[PDB]
Design a binder for this molecule. Structure first.
Ligand SMILES: CCCCCCCC/C=C\CCCCCCCC(=O)OC[C@H](COP(=O)(O)OC[C@H](N)C(=O)O)OC(=O)CCCCCCC/C=C\CCCCCCCC
Ligand SMILES: CCCCCCCC/C=C\CCCCCCCC(=O)OC[C@H](COP(=O)(O)OC[C@H](N)C(=O)O)OC(=O)CCCCCCC/C=C\CCCCCCCC
Length: 1800
């Protein structure tokens, strides 16, 4: 098994990283349970409320009468909404009050006092024409008969008992308004008395509270012409007839004493002998006197003082409308205003306009509501404002008067309003918005797992360790499938444990959790392969965490701005904005929440069917999410093939079409080195041999071991060791050998002893359970070279296997390699030549892309070496030494004449003659008198051969230095067109977007708009239903109503044909005509909300309400349905939820289709005889007419009028729909206009004249403008927050330049080597304001670019310009110290943006101290007075309130000057501008704090004495340093040199103390760090020149010294900006050498020693001696061997702070050494007898190396084991013992240094 064990290993790895971090795993599983245990608690504190079916009673308008109007004003003040239909919704019946006391009184009075007994009463009274008396047996007889017959008829015994009972009561707590409210309807000195009386009952004051404007307030009418007075006399005729209740008290008081004075004299004389002569009724006549006049006077004593509280006058003229507004606002604060009629226009058209208050008329900027509420919108206070405010009670007083004036012919048709019935429903505000708050709460709940998958995928690539698996045989199918199946772990487990929360905490009940899980487990396979695609762009694992969450939440906001404008969203633009995955979950979630409002959720059998018409099902959403996963991790398997990163080869425009060599021969037993050049030759050959790309780039084409193109054969034979430590962090040491063992062939049982063998051979068997985070940095590299040898490899390619390693571990690595070579082949390729000399074999070098030479280093020394050299160890005279050297062989030379030593150049042919022992036996006899203590031998070093064979194939002088900083910062600005100008464009873009976003919201206070009342809703349905057609008059009004609706006049063709039913469906017919119904019968029922099946509106079958009624269509688009003789409160209930169904998709601006309609019909069917009472009063008008109209006969006129005008009244119910806000008055207006064009004589279609009304509320006041304005003044707060955020943004781009430039070169070379901090640390500020000034102005002009804030004038922006100029002068010092305190590289950018956002949100909540409430003791004023002073220490926030208050003052002055008189502008005044200038004009103090950080240098010659280090280092002499570091060695030199602090003891810093003498401490010490001291982005020598010319130049030494640095550095021939590997530390050290032209001081420096090729290091280690040769100090740090051999002296090594050694390297090689090295080449069939010969001549001479004929021998000094004999006998006796060619040297002191490595 190959794939299915690579997958098990690659999936066990991800499980082991996911197990060792159990706060990653626990937090990412309890975080989506702190987001969905908030929704469970917001659900259980807003439960659904379910309401029954409301049927409402009717509200008659004053056209109906004055007793029905007052009954429907006082009684049904509440809109009770009965569940059974009221008696005023059924056809014919009109008034639902025929059991109250008033209506029974009028009924009995009309049926008795107009009855048939009054007929014979008037017949008896007609006999009195005789001359008897002017006020006889037979007229007395007839009158007695008739009156006695009528006596029992007035014993009506059913209402008058109740009236006498109600009037004669004790007082009680019955208020003077609650007294009438038992009689009307059953289930100002005179006003102020009852006003005090009414307070005892809250219902009484709640009825008076809005009855008060109608009976106190006044009414005003504007243009005051003859026409207007002629009209408003008719409106005053309504309040005139209410003062006929009062003059009957006048008639009663002039009649009452006349009756009462007929007592005790007339009762005996004047009536007793006239009445009592003749049973029951003569006994009733005398039993009547006591309670007759007293009770009717007690009745009229109350009735008549109600007229005394009504004003006599309510009308009052005006000159014009502009005086009406002023007089109105005068009267309104007097508490006496009803309304103001304003007539209008310049013929017959009338243009009435009612201007009311604004707490009293409904507001007029909308015709509907934004968010559909499923109520009936019938609440008596908050949305019937036309009814209790009194708009519609005044409308059809005025309309009826205009109808009566424009036409003549007093119409009579009373109007009754009637709201429509409404079905059973539920109100559930949580689930109406769940399509908007479920996507948000799961985009945030899975944003922590998306950042963990992007972090893991990118760190498997940043650490160069996806490369070391794909170069180990692994696929790219496997690597990506192991990330898919393992990042779908927690995603698919936290989407199976929040389905329980949804179904079980009732967020989505009635659903079935299978269908919800399988829709949340296709969103989770489309967000895994999105966090892969987001990680195909990045290469850093810490930027990726902070951009994965941001680009996962930035893909959701296209759903937020797509649910808002959902109405105008075409369905193609919704199946193509579902190609972002957090949006296709939006449109599936809005369709899973439309199936909850229909009772049954997402079950298995509706998961293919769309709920409403233009929505998705759930199967189309899951299909879109899988398509949207497929083509979305299909980009990754393309995008990483054409942009792999920056290590790796691209492969553009894919289709799926699909040891040896020419040059070398590596052998089967050697340890071949490969040291050529890090150029075009070396890294390509190991790449081709390691097979990562096919070969075409020059070098060679012979396939190496088996076959280059059959790589899977030799992939289990060779192992590579890369540069990087191939090592997983959180896997322990044993599991690495296990993992790379099982991945590379070997079965699961043969891998067993392999762990034992490796962990024994590397030296790690104790710590075989430590994670490899917890390993020292040279123990990892010695493990990571041991897992190249696993599985028995043979052709092991190593690749620099010692870089950056502590030298003890570097010898451990060499021991490991030297034992692992006997049966293998090693091709290690290093730079440092000590390895290739020491552990070398046949050494091959390449140069220029081709092979240069190869062979053993002895062979290369034979045919390329110069020859032997002799050095002398100890001015006597040079030519005597020349003669002594040229005594034997005259071809020699003495190359360097030094006073300390000499070095010769001898020919190696000179020793080939056997002339060695002659030389040194004479020198053994001559060194006694040459004044020299000894000699030593040397060969040509291997680096000489290497370089030589490479040669074949290859007061004003301080202010001109601002410019030195300025051009480096200027070129930083100029060259960074790829990572910058996000510091300029971003704030202008954000301030433009913020000002554009301040356009959607209209301002407040602009209620009063003209609003033509007629029907304005557009296309609509509106019915009608004629009740009784018997009379010709109301057959005209019907036609006029239709011609109002838009119906044409009926032509002579199809004359009885305008209406026609649609097609009834047949199933409807066979379900209707089988339950035996007629249009007055109930229809089939509809199903309400069962216990456990709640739903908004009921589920109605198709035959609910009946067949469709005979409709017709107009031309304006108004369906008009004939609905005559059907049950009209059964049709309107059962067809409501199917008219409004397209508005149940979005629930915003819902066009309900049917808004109202009419219902005609004559008077109430019931009690007859409207003309009998008039006949009775007309007959009883005889004999009683004293005053013809003198306040007595007017009673008789109005009583005859009240009788005669009773039977001929029409009706109109007006059904309205209150969710349209203006339907009440639209249809009252159409009714009045249609009554007008019916009494026109020529034809009802009269096109001359027409009533219109408007609705224009009255001018607002100061607390009415300002309160609504400050409530609306919140989008400008968002504008201000965006302004302060975007303008605080770009200094966080400024400080990035200082983040990686803290201390690294400028602070510790440019400011310390010559001590100039004074310019630099304020010149950063100067350059920041210099390059802030233009991104200030370029943000200033975005105000002007969009006409949304700027508005050109001196009053706005004379100082906001200066405000936006001083922001960056202020903000610059207070946010530098993220750089030079708590150094973090490019990671606290999130922190800096967050803290500026925290400043902005403190400024945001600063001014919002008030929302609705306030307290008593000036606490808000004290809090805003404290925030006035709170701007003192916070320069980022004080402005953030001044911009707010300045915008408010701007708009305040604009309003108060464009509405009222002229006030002073305050553009510069103290409360906004001068105090802010005084606050902000001190950032130099913060600049001094920032520079005082540098004056403390931080956030707030060598004598060592037991710090047993007995070290004396004198200045002026070079000193060496080797050994180990990191144990307290470099730190010890740091606390010597001042980087670190020591706690106890004493410290010497050049004889100067720190806290005692600051001047001597600053001036006398300069110490370069070891932290790769460079600013990486430069352009080369010219930075170095200009930092040199920061000191002492008359603008002319720049050229001289730049020419010197160009001439003396030959490494400047390359590009004007070099690459970075070519430049760097070598030019930096040459720059320091150039900087010491003015430095005669100690230059003890860390010398970082960047590991470059030795070609430039020849010039470096020559010129560092050649420049500093004056006798001053030279300091360098050695870590490899050749730089120790280049320039060293007496060297110090710390061994736990103890010295066990001391000496210069000549002293070290004299005392501590081990003699000489014999290098020898013999054939292997002769080598061990040659070793026997060596042991014969040298019994006991030590041998170190013996392999392949390569023999090395260690020769101790003393006797024959020393020099002077050995090469002589090897020339004599060793010549015939198989030796062909060999050389000797003194011991190269790596192995002498092995004792120094064994010291520790
Ligand atoms: C950086 C950009 C960020 C992008 C984010 C913006 C997009 C989405 C953000 C938030 C989601 C919601 C968006 C903000 C509000 C959404 C709309 C809103 O809620 O307005 C006020 C609502 C009134 O609306 P309705 O629900 O009555 O709607 C009428 C009708 N059904 C319809 O379909 O329209 O009254 C109420 O809130 C009910 C109060 C009493 C019961 C409350 C109970 C229910 C209320 C809330 C439920 C939990 C939501 C909590 C939200 C807090 C986080 C903001
Ligand atoms: C109002 C509600 C706001 C909700 C915001 C949710 C954010 C996280 C919520 C709670 C965190 C819980 C508190 C933190 C827990 C403390 C522990 C902690 O710091 O974790 C850091 C983790 C560590 O994982 P690693 O990356 O090191 O490796 C994990 C790897 N995959 C593996 O398992 O092998 O990496 C990270 O996540 C670093 C990023 C930090 C996470 C935030 C990353 C978010 C970054 C940017 C997006 C923020 C919000 C989006 C911007 C506007 C939204 C308003």
């Amino acid at each position: 098994m190959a794939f299915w064990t690579q997958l098990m290993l690659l999936l066990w790895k991800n499980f082991m990283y996911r197990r060792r971090q159990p706060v990653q795993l626990l937090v990412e599983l309890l975080w989506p349970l702190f987001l969905f245990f908030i929704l469970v608690a917001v659900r259980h504190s807003h439960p659904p409320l379910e309401h029954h079916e409301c049927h409402f009673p009717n509200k008659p308008l004053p056209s109906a009468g004055t007793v029905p109007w007052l009954q429907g004003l006082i009684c049904n003040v509440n809109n009770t909404c009965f569940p059974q239909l009221t008696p005023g919704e059924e056809p014919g019946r009109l008034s639902n009050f025929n059991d109250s006391l008033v209506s029974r009184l009028l009924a009995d009075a009309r049926t008795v006092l107009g009855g048939a007994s009054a007929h014979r009463t008037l017949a008896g009274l007609g006999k009195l024409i005789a001359t008897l008396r002017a006020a006889a047996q037979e007229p007395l007889h007839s009158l007695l008969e008739a009156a006695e017959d009528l006596a029992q008829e007035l014993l009506a015994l059913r209402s008058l008992v109740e009236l006498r009972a109600l009037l004669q009561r004790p007082r009680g707590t019955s208020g003077p308004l609650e007294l009438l409210s038992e009689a009307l309807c059953s289930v100002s000195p005179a006003c102020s008395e009852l006003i005090g009386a009414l307070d005892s009952h809250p219902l009484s004051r709640l009825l008076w509270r809005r009855l008060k404007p109608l009976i106190l307030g006044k009414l005003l009418f504007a243009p005051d012409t003859p026409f207007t007075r002629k009209l408003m006399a008719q409106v005053n005729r309504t309040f005139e007839e209410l003062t006929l209740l009062r003059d009957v008290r006048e008639v009663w008081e002039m009649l009452g004493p006349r009756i009462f004075t007929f007592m005790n004299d007339s009762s005996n004389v004047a009536m007793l002998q006239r009445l009592l002569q003749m049973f029951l009724d003569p006994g009733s006549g005398g039993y009547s006197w006591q309670d007759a006049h007293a009770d009717v006077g007690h009745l009229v004593g109350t009735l008549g003082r109600v007229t005394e509280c009504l004003s006599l006058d309510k009308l009052e003229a005006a000159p014009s409308e502009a005086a009406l507004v002023s007089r109105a606002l005068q009267l309104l604060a007097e508490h006496r205003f009803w309304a103001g009629v304003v007539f209008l226009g310049p013929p017959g058209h009338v243009r009435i306009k009612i201007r009311m208050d604004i707490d009293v008329v409904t507001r007029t900027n909308k015709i509907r509501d934004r968010f559909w509420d499923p109520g009936p919108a019938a609440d008596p206070l908050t949305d019937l404002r036309y009814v209790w405010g009194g708009f519609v009670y005044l409308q059809d007083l005025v309309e009826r008067a205009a109808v009566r004036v424009l036409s003549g012919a007093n119409p009579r048709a009373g109007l009754y309003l009637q709201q429509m019935p409404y079905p059973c429903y539920v109100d559930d505000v949580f689930l109406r918005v769940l399509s908007r708050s479920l996507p948000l709460f799961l985009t945030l709940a899975w944003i922590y797992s998306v950042t963990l998958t992007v972090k893991a995928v990118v760190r498997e690539k940043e650490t160069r360790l996806r490369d070391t698996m794909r170069a180990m045989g692994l696929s790219r199918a496997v690597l990506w499938l192991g990330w898919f199946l393992s990042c779908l772990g927690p995603f698919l487990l936290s989407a199976a444990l929040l389905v329980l929360v949804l179904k079980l905490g009732d967020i989505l009940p009635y659903s079935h959790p299978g269908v919800v899980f399988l829709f949340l487990a296709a969103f989770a396979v489309a967000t895994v392969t999105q966090s892969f695609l987001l990680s195909a762009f990045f290469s850093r694992a810490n930027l990726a965490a902070a951009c994965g969450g941001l680009a996962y939440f930035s893909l959701y906001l296209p759903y937020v701005l797509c649910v808002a404008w959902r109405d105008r969203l075409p369905a193609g633009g919704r199946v193509a904005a579902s190609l972002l995955s957090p949006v296709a979950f939006g449109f599936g979630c809005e369709s899973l929440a439309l199936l909850e409002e229909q009772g049954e959720g997402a079950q298995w059998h509706n998961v293919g069917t769309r709920p409403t018409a233009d929505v998705f099902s759930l199967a189309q959403v899951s299909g879109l999410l899988l398509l949207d996963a497929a083509l979305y991790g299909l980009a990754t398997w393309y995008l990483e093939a054409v942009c792999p990163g920056q290590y790796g080869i691209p492969e553009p425009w894919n289709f799926p079409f699909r040891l040896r060599g020419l040059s070398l021969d590596f052998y089967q037993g050697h340890i071949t080195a490969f040291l050529g050049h890090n150029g075009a030759g070396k890294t390509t050959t190991l790449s081709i041999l390691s097979g990562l790309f096919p070969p075409s780039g020059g070098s060679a084409f012979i396939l190496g071991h088996d076959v280059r193109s059959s790589m899977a054969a030799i992939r289990p034979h060779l192992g590579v060791c890369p540069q990087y430590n191939v090592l997983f962090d959180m896997l322990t040491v044993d599991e690495h050998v296990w993992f790379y063992g099982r991945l590379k062939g070997l079965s699961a049982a043969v891998v067993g002893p392999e762990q034992d063998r490796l962990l024994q051979d590397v030296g790690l068997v104790s710590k075989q359970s430590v994670q490899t985070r917890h390993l020292s940095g040279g123990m990892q590299r010695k493990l990571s070279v041991a897992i190249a040898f696993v599985g028995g490899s043979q052709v092991v390619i190593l690749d620099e296997p010692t870089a950056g390693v502590d030298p003890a571990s570097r010898r451990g690595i060499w021991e490991l390699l030297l034992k692992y070579r006997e049966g293998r082949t090693l091709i290690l390729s290093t730079h440092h030549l000590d390895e290739a000399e020491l552990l070398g074999d046949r050494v091959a070098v390449v140069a220029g892309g081709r092979l240069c030479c190869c062979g053993s280093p002895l062979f290369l020394r034979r045919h390329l070496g110069s020859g032997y050299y002799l050095t002398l160890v100890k001015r006597v005279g040079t030519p005597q030494l020349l003669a002594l050297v040229q005594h034997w062989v005259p071809g020699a030379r003495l190359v360097e004449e030094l006073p300390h030593e000499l070095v010769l150049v001898l020919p190696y042919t000179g020793a080939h003659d056997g002339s060695f022992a002659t030389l040194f036996r004479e020198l053994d006899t001559r060194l006694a008198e040459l004044r020299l203590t000894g000699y030593g031998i040397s060969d040509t070093s291997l680096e000489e051969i290497f370089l030589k064979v490479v040669e074949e194939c290859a007061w004003a002088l301080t202010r001109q230095q601002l410019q030195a900083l300025l051009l480096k910062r200027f070129l930083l600005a100029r060259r960074s067109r790829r990572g910058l100008f996000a510091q300029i464009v971003l704030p202008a873009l954000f301030v433009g977007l913020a000002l554009v976003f301040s356009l959607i919201v209209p301002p407040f206070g602009h209620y009063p708009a003209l609003r033509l009342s007629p029907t304005m809703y557009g296309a609509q349905v509106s019915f009608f239903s004629e009740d009784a057609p018997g009379d010709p008059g109301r057959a005209r009004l019907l036609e006029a109503l239709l011609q109002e609706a838009g119906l044409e006049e009926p032509p002579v063709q199809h004359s009885s044909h305008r209406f026609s039913a649609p097609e009834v469906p047949a199933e409807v017919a066979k379900v209707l005509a089988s339950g035996n119904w007629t249009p007055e019968s109930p229809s089939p029922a509809c199903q309400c909300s069962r216990p456990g099946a709640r739903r908004l509106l009921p589920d109605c079958p198709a035959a609910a309400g009946g067949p469709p009624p005979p409709q017709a269509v107009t031309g304006s688009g108004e369906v008009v349905q004939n609905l005559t003789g059907r049950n009209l409160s059964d049709f309107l209930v059962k067809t409501y939820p199917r008219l409004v169904r397209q508005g149940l998709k979005t629930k915003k601006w819902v066009n309900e289709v049917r808004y109202g309609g009419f219902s005609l019909g004559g008077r109430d069917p019931g009690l007859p005889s409207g003309q009998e009472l008039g006949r009775s009063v007309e007959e009883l008008w005889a004999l009683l007419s004293p005053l013809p109209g003198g306040a007595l006969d007017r009673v008789l006129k109005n009583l005859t009028a009240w009788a005669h005008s009773l039977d001929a009244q029409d009706s109109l119910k007006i059904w309205f729909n209150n969710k349209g806000w203006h339907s009440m008055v639209a249809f009252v207006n159409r009714a009045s206009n249609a009554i007008l064009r019916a009494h026109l004589p020529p034809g009802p279609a009269r096109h001359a004249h027409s009533i219109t009304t408007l609705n224009h509320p009255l001018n607002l006041t100061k607390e009415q403008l300002s309160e609504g304005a400050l409530m609306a003044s919140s989008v400008d707060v968002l504008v201000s927050i965006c302004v302060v955020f975007a303008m605080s943004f770009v200094p966080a781009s400024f400080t990035l330049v200082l983040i990686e430039e803290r201390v690294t070169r400028a602070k510790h070379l440019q400011l310390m080597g010559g001590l100039s901090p004074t310019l630099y640390w304020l010149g950063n500020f100067l350059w920041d304001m210099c390059n802030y000034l233009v991104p200030a102005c370029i943000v200033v002009l975005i105000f002007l670019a969009f006409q949304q804030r700027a508005y050109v004038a001196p009053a706005n922006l004379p100082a906001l310009l200066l405000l936006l100029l001083l922001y960056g002068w202020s903000i610059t010092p207070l946010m530098y110290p993220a750089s030079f305190f708590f150094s973090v590289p490019s990671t606290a950018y999130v922190v800096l943006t967050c803290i500026n956002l925290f400043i902005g949100i403190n400024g945001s909540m600063a001014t919002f101290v008030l929302e609705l409430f306030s307290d008593q003791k000036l606490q808000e004023v004290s809090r805003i007075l404290k925030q006035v002073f709170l701007i003192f220490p916070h320069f980022c926030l004080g402005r953030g309130l001044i911009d707010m208050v300045r915008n408010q003052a701007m708009a305040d002055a604009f309003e108060r000057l464009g509405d009222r008189q002229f006030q002073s502008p305050l553009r510069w005044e103290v409360v906004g501008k001068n105090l802010l200038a005084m606050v902000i004009q001190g950032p130099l103090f913060l600049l001094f704090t920032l520079l005082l950080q540098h004056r403390s240098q931080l956030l707030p010659v060598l004598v060592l004495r037991n710090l047993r280090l007995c070290l004396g280092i004198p200045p002026g002499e070079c000193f060496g340093l080797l050994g180990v570091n990191g144990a307290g060695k470099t730190s010890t030199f740091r606390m010597v040199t001042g980087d670190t602090l020591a706690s106890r003891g004493e410290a010497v810093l050049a004889g100067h103390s720190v806290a005692r003498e600051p001047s001597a401490a600053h001036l006398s010490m300069g110490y370069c760090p070891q932290s790769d001291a460079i600013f990486e982005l430069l352009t080369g020598r010219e930075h170095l020149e200009l930092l040199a010319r920061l000191r002492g130049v008359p603008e002319a030494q720049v050229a001289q010294t730049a020419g010197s640095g160009l001439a003396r550095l030959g490494l400047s021939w390359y590009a004007d900006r070099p690459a970075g590997t070519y430049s760097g530390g070598n030019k930096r050290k040459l720059a320091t050498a150039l900087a010491l032209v003015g430095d005669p001081a100690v230059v003890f420096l860390d010398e970082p020693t960047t590991g470059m090729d030795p070609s430039a290091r020849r010039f470096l280690w020559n010129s560092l001696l050649a420049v500093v040769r004056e006798g001053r100090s030279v300091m360098l740090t050695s870590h490899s061997m050749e730089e120790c051999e280049a320039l060293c002296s007496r060297l110090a090594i710390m061994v736990n702070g103890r010295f066990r050694c001391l000496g210069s390297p000549q002293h070290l090689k004299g005392r501590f050494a081990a003699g000489h090295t014999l290098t020898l080449r013999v054939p292997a069939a002769r080598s061990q007898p040659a070793a026997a010969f060596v042991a014969a001549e040298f019994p006991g001479a030590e041998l170190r190396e013996a392999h392949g004929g390569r023999l090395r021998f260690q020769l101790p000094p003393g006797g024959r084991c020393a020099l002077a004999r050995v090469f002589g006998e090897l020339a004599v006796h060793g010549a015939e013992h198989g030796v062909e060619d060999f050389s000797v040297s003194q011991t190269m002191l790596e192995e002498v240094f092995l004792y120094f490595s064994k010291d520790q």
